[PDB]
Design an enzyme around this catalytic site. Structure first.
Site, PDB file in Angstrom:
ATOM      1  CB  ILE A 174     -44.404  29.742  -4.567  1.00 12.56           C
ATOM      2  CG1 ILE A 174     -43.611  30.913  -3.923  1.00 12.56           C
ATOM      3  CG2 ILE A 174     -44.853  30.471  -5.998  1.00 12.56           C
ATOM      4  CD1 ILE A 174     -42.442  31.492  -4.445  1.00 12.56           C
ATOM      5  CB  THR A 212     -48.128  23.867 -16.965  1.00 13.72           C
ATOM      6  OG1 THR A 212     -47.107  25.297 -17.005  1.00 13.72           O
ATOM      7  CG2 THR A 212     -49.625  24.712 -17.307  1.00 13.72           C
ATOM      8  CB  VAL A 263     -44.218  21.721  -6.197  1.00 16.96           C
ATOM      9  CG1 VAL A 263     -44.240  22.675  -5.398  1.00 16.96           C
ATOM     10  CG2 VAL A 263     -45.174  20.429  -6.120  1.00 16.96           C
ATOM     11  CE  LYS A 282     -41.988  25.591 -13.570  1.00 15.43           C
ATOM     12  NZ  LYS A 282     -43.165  25.649 -14.646  1.00 15.43           N
ATOM     13  CG  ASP A 340     -50.283  35.900  -9.177  1.00 19.38           C
ATOM     14  OD1 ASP A 340     -51.215  36.639  -9.192  1.00 19.38           O
ATOM     15  OD2 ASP A 340     -49.934  34.812  -8.866  1.00 19.38           O
ATOM     16  CG  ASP A 347     -51.622  28.794 -19.668  1.00 21.80           C
ATOM     17  OD1 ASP A 347     -52.889  29.192 -19.509  1.00 21.80           O
ATOM     18  OD2 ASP A 347     -51.021  28.048 -18.626  1.00 21.80           O
ATOM     19  N   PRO A 362     -53.231  36.046 -16.239  1.00 20.99           N
ATOM     20  CG  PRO A 362     -55.062  37.594 -15.173  1.00 20.99           C
ATOM     21  CD  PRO A 362     -54.687  36.230 -15.982  1.00 20.99           C
TER      22      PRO A 362
HETATM   23  N1  LIG Z   1     -48.983  33.787  -5.519  1.00 19.34           N
HETATM   24  S1  LIG Z   1     -48.246  35.256  -5.348  1.00 19.34           S
HETATM   25  O1  LIG Z   1     -48.903  36.074  -6.465  1.00 19.34           O
HETATM   26  O2  LIG Z   1     -48.330  35.888  -3.999  1.00 19.34           O
HETATM   27  C1  LIG Z   1     -46.933  34.992  -5.980  1.00 19.34           C
HETATM   28  C2  LIG Z   1     -45.686  34.963  -5.109  1.00 19.34           C
HETATM   29  C3  LIG Z   1     -44.388  34.720  -5.652  1.00 19.34           C
HETATM   30  C4  LIG Z   1     -44.325  34.329  -7.139  1.00 19.34           C
HETATM   31  N2  LIG Z   1     -42.774  33.780  -7.440  1.00 19.34           N
HETATM   32  C5  LIG Z   1     -42.638  33.254  -8.797  1.00 19.34           C
HETATM   33  N3  LIG Z   1     -43.726  32.381  -9.204  1.00 19.34           N
HETATM   34  C6  LIG Z   1     -43.389  31.750 -10.467  1.00 19.34           C
HETATM   35  C7  LIG Z   1     -44.555  30.795 -10.851  1.00 19.34           C
HETATM   36  C8  LIG Z   1     -44.655  30.027 -12.136  1.00 19.34           C
HETATM   37  C9  LIG Z   1     -45.819  29.390 -12.619  1.00 19.34           C
HETATM   38  C10 LIG Z   1     -47.159  29.455 -11.691  1.00 19.34           C
HETATM   39  C11 LIG Z   1     -46.920  30.044 -10.522  1.00 19.34           C
HETATM   40  C12 LIG Z   1     -48.081  30.202  -9.746  1.00 19.34           C
HETATM   41  C13 LIG Z   1     -48.838  31.356  -9.530  1.00 19.34           C
HETATM   42  C14 LIG Z   1     -49.750  31.441  -8.834  1.00 19.34           C
HETATM   43  C15 LIG Z   1     -50.249  30.245  -8.050  1.00 19.34           C
HETATM   44  C16 LIG Z   1     -49.615  29.114  -8.353  1.00 19.34           C
HETATM   45  C17 LIG Z   1     -48.666  29.027  -9.032  1.00 19.34           C
HETATM   46  C18 LIG Z   1     -45.981  30.803 -10.040  1.00 19.34           C
HETATM   47  C19 LIG Z   1     -42.359  31.773 -11.029  1.00 19.34           C
HETATM   48  N4  LIG Z   1     -41.817  31.109 -12.246  1.00 19.34           N
HETATM   49  C20 LIG Z   1     -40.530  31.751 -12.240  1.00 19.34           C
HETATM   50  N5  LIG Z   1     -40.281  32.472 -11.301  1.00 19.34           N
HETATM   51  C21 LIG Z   1     -41.408  32.639 -10.482  1.00 19.34           C
HETATM   52  N6  LIG Z   1     -41.602  33.194  -9.497  1.00 19.34           N
HETATM   53  C22 LIG Z   1     -45.484  34.154  -7.959  1.00 19.34           C
HETATM   54  C23 LIG Z   1     -46.780  34.538  -7.428  1.00 19.34           C
END
Ligand SMILES: NS(=O)(=O)c1ccc(Nc2nc(-c3cccc(-c4ccccc4)c3)c3[nH]cnc3n2)cc1
EC number: 2.7.11.22
Lengths: 255, 296
Positions: free
Chosen positions: B11, B15, B18, B34, B87, B128, B131
């Protein structure tokens, strides 16, 4: 941040009741004693000096050790491994620049391998169920210090000193919550220097009157009066220094 | 341990390594898994993971991403989280041609403020907000999401870690190199993001500390001892700073109504002691007609 002073005070009072180690634990340990634990807590203080660790780190390290030993028997041979791994974790949780793992291996005189210290860290976390954000005597003292008029550098450092001394002797201090050990330390410090008592603002904020503090206050009075002869002396040495205004030197009061 | 979970796809990278989508094979729950990599060298378990797991065990709130489980295996540590669909970064890029409706922006600010007030009242700053870390679902919820740069604070605060929010969302008291920051740094982030939902572009998009800081000065004006007592003797203040005039907030965020402008100005007060707290902001007139509409 007076918006969250009260919410946080309230919340750390909920929390100290849940990180409470079992008072009896020492009695149930087959191999270790209150005075092995004192050696260990005095040794951690010396480590805290050698790496200029924060007082908080020391206080969390002790909270982790007492919970650890609350549910897990440890031989004398490993007591220090438990302490090392706890002090590593506390540092990681609390410090901006935590010492490398290698530095903690170096201060056990290589009586333990790095491979061991890491395995113990994994275990101390499993037993503490990752719940490392523990209230300490120090987080209460700090809050308490804002109800002090005028502020007084001598009072604060002495208050901290008595809070730190309380970490050494598991009997009697394991039975008192941190908010109380703080109360006592603060009032005992305030009387020893300015000759004032636990203020009314702190009665309104904690609900501890000067008389609810009495039991603990009686013990702390004695630890402080008997502090020069006590076998572990690193905390006394620590608080002679200019930083803490040499309050370990300050001669304790009559009653 | 992982016998239970089937990985769907990666996904993202957060920080500390993966994050993957996954299915609980037995309950059918979709989760975000994670993965942290451990080594009898890596200094064992990362400081960032220790604070995230420990702080987030304490924070159950409907606008904070819930930590479901923590799986120690031999060399791997997996944090199982609730999964959100998308997000706010991705959503603002997908909502560019028609803008985000004001009810939705208001719903989302309200819920984030709720999550923040909660964090703050449990002695936790996020440090932190951006968006990329605010996740949304199809139902109209939004939640805070990467507690790996968070830390527990004391009352009063100590000097904490210095270069600390991502630049665009970094508050002026960090850029000026103060000793003490507290809760006010997250509110500043949230004010920036509130601007960004309204206008669809970042409010102060610098590429250095000085550039970031001049950008802020050009929109709020250069702070002097009147609007910010202390300011001219902060460590990274320079008397050689230019003096720009404060701009009227009707020009900073033109779509915004009489009240949203008020809120936003209180979120971006320069002085951190007068800057609105998340808790106080929930009561602000802007939200008198808040509801909970759905996006997508
Ligand atoms: N990329 S998208 O908008 O289509 C998209 C699709 C699915 C998710 N699902 C998701 N992400 C993180 C998570 C946590 C930290 C960082 C990120 C992240 C966000 C964007 C890009 C890379 C990592 C996601 C979570 N932490 C805990 N639960 C979580 N669930 C997030 C973004």
């Amino acid at each position: 941040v007076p918006d969250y002073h009260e919410d946080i005070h309230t919340y750390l009072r909920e929390m100290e009741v849940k990180c409470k180690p079992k008072v009896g634990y020492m009695k149930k340990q087959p191999d270790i004693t209150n005075s092995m634990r004192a050696i260990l807590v005095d040794w951690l203080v010396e480590v805290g000096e050698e790496y200029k660790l924060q007082n908080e780190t020391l206080h969390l390290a002790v909270n982790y050790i007492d919970r650890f030993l609350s549910s897990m028997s440890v031989l004398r041979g490993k007591l220090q491994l438990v302490g090392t791994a706890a002090m590593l974790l506390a540092s990681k949780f609390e410090e901006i620049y935590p010492p490398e793992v290698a530095e903690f291996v170096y201060i056990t005189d290589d009586t333990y391998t790095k491979k061991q210290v890491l395995r113990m860290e994994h275990l101390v976390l499993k037993v503490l169920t990752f719940d490392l954000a523990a209230p300490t005597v120090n987080q209460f003292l700090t809050q308490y210090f804002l109800h002090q008029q005028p502020a007084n550098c001598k009072v604060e450092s002495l208050a901290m000193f008595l809070g730190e001394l309380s970490l050494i002797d598991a009997d009697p201090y394991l039975k008192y919550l941190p908010s109380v050990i703080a109360g006592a330390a603060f009032h005992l410090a305030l009387y020893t220097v300015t000759g004032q008592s636990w203020p009314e603002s702190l009665i309104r904020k904690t609900g501890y009157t000067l008389e609810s503090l009495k039991p603990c206050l009686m013990d702390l009075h004695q630890t402080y009066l008997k502090a020069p002869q006590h076998a572990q002396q690193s905390i006394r040495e620590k608080y002679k220094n200019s930083k803490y205004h040499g309050v370990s030197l300050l001669n304790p009061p009559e009653t | 341990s992982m016998e239970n979970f089937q990985k769907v796809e990666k996904i993202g990278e957060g920080t500390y390594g993966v994050v993957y989508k996954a299915r609980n094979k037995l309950t059918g729950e979709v989760v975000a898994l994670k993965k942290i990599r451990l080594d009898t060298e890596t200094e064992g378990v990362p400081s960032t993971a220790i604070r995230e797991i420990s702080l987030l065990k304490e924070l159950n709130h409907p606008n904070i991403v819930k930590l479901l489980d923590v799986i120690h295996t031999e060399n791997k540590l997996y944090l199982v989280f609730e999964f959100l669909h998308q997000d706010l970064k991705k959503f603002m890029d997908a909502s560019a041609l028609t803008g985000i409706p004001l009810p939705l922006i208001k719903s989302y600010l309200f819920q984030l403020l709720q999550g923040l007030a909660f964090c703050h009242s449990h002695r936790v700053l996020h440090r932190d907000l951006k968006p990329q870390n605010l996740l949304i679902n199809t139902e109209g919820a939004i939640k805070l999401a990467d507690f790996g740069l968070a830390r527990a604070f004391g009352v009063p605060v100590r000097t904490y870690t210095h270069e600390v929010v991502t630049l665009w969302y970094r508050a002026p008291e960090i850029l000026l190199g103060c000793k003490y920051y507290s809760t006010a740094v997250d509110i500043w982030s949230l004010g920036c993001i509130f601007a960004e939902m309204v206008t669809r572009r970042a409010l102060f998009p610098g590429d250095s500390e000085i550039d970031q800081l001049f950008r802020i000065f050009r929109t709020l004006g250069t702070p002097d001892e009147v609007v910010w007592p202390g300011v001219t003797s902060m460590p990274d203040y320079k008397p050689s700073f230019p003096k720009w005039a404060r701009q009227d907030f009707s020009k900073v965020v033109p779509p915004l109504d009489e009240d949203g402008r008020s809120l936003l100005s209180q979120m971006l007060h320069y002085d951190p002691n007068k800057r609105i707290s998340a808790k106080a902001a929930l009561a602000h007139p802007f939200f008198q007609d808040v509801t909970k509409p759905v996006p997508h």
